[PDB]
């Protein structure tokens, strides 16, 4: 909830 650690923006 703090960071979207699973965000699709990552590589």
């Amino acid at each position, epitope marked *: *909830q*703090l*960071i*979207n650690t699973n*965000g699709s*923006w*990552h*590589v």
Partner: antibody
Framework: VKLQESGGGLVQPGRSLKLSCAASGFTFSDSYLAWVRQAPTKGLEWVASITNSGGRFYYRDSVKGRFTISRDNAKSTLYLQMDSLRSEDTATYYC?????WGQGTTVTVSS | DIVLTQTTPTLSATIGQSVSISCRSSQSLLESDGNTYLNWLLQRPGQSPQLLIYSVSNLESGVPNRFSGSGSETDFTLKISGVEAEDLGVYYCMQTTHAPTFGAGTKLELKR
């Protein structure tokens, strides 16, 4: 929780610099971290971020190809290799877990 | 890229007054997992950003109850119910649903 940046200083353009973030008071290997910079004219910016065990990372369009994020879970340290530095990169560098931020390290790039 | 807009760049308040800092997003911040990744940070003079509220409305441990967050999918609001001297600084909204971006900040100065 405790986080401590280091590595900041003055450099000319094109030069390289490596920051580091000493971590204590938490299980570093379970935490997702980020490098956030603060310039006067640009404001707050997400530079690079990485995953708890590695595997996934992120670099903003401005820093792709020049910057490198990494971590040593055994040493509780987060890193940012900044190569081919520009005046645009001038800002104060924060190592963060969002809930906890470090005091920062200032990076100045000028001729 | 997501644009976070903080309409009012400066807010003047007296000690004890209630205040609302707004953030508007260019696109919906609701992620596939049903969570909306909007955070609120306070930067006191000469100090580093500090997390106040995460996921629109969740109060971070150690943050006084006078702070509260609310929002839709594109409209977000931080509320300070009775401002104190320690609340003076710049308040930044921030998202991670998409490639992370920050708003430009709201300066909370003291009315005199």
């Amino acid at each position: 929780v405790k986080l401590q940046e280091s590595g900041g200083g003055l450099v000319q353009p094109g030069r390289s610099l490596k920051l580091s973030c000493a971590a204590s008071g938490f299980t570093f290997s379970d935490s997702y971290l980020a490098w956030v910079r603060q310039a006067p004219t640009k404001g707050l910016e997400w530079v690079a971020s990485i995953t708890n065990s590695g595997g996934r990372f992120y670099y903003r369009d401005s820093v792709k190809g020049r910057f490198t994020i990494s971590r040593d879970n055994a040493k509780s340290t987060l890193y940012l290799q900044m190569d081919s530095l520009r005046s645009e990169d001038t800002a104060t560098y924060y190592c963060t877990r969002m809930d906890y931020w470090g005091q920062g390290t200032t990076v100045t790039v000028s001729s | 890229d997501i644009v976070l807009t903080q309409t009012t760049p400066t807010l003047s308040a007296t000690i004890g007054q209630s205040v609302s800092i707004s953030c508007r997003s260019s696109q919906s911040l609701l992620e596939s997992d049903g969570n909306t990744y909007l955070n609120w940070l306070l930067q006191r003079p000469g100090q580093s950003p500090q997390l106040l509220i995460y996921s629109v409305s969740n109060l971070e441990s150690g943050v006084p109850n006078r702070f509260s967050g609310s929002g839709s999918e594109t409209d977000f609001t931080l509320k300070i119910s009775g401002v104190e001297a320690e609340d003076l600084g710049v308040y930044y909204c921030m998202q991670t649903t998409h490639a992370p971006t920050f708003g430009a900040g709201t300066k909370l100065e003291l009315k005199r």
